Amino acid sequence: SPGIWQLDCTHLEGKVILVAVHVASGYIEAEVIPAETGQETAYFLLKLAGRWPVKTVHTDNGSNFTSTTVKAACWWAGIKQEDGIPYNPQSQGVIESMNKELKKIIGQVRDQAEHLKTAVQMAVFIHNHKRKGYSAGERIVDIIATDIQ
């Protein structure tokens, strides 16, 4: 579980928000892109895997699952690429709820920035620091450190 991430793609202001969630912790990383392509998805995964020990990625759709550019980035980064099918049905609604919460946070900071990408980074910050009593940021470091020891 400590190396498992889920990709998620949501839309806002005619742009795409690409999200990776660390499944065990709820910790997230996100970027704004004009549209979801294999190339953008590949680049995002290279960034992610250089920062956290990404073992497995459940891709967000079949186009990223299929993409030769994505499969190449996963190979390069030592990531096992998986489908994102909610064999546990809980997952569709869990992603739904995350997007809705993320979009709520974005609405709360939207007026503090000109550009969507900036508001998204502020929302990532707020999400990751929110105490739930640990934050997502605390959980991920705890989970991975235990795994190393």
List residues near a copy of itself by CB under 8 A.
Answer: 29, 43, 46-47, 49-53, 76-77, 112, 117-118, 121-122, 124-125, 128-129, 134, 137-138, 141-142, 144-146, 148-149
Residues 103-142 that bind ligand IMV (CB under 6 A): 112-115, 118, 122, 127
The item of Cl ion, ligand IMV, a copy of itself, none sharing an interface with residue 125, based on CB under 5 to 8 Å by kind, is a copy of itself
Give the distance between the most distant pair of CA atoms in the chain: 44
The item of a copy of itself, Cl ion, ligand IMV, none sharing an interface with residue 95, based on CB under 5 to 8 Å by kind, is ligand IMV
Contact 19, 10 (CB under 8 A): yes
CA–CA separation, 130 and 123 (whole Å): 10
CA–CA separation, 102 and 61 (whole Å): 20
**120 is written with which tokens?**
């998204």
Cα angle 6, 10, 16 (rounded to 5 degrees) comes to: 115
Residues that bind ligand IMV (CB under 6 A): 6, 21, 23, 26, 28, 39, 42-43, 46, 69, 72-73, 76, 94-95, 97-98, 101-102, 112-115, 118, 122, 127
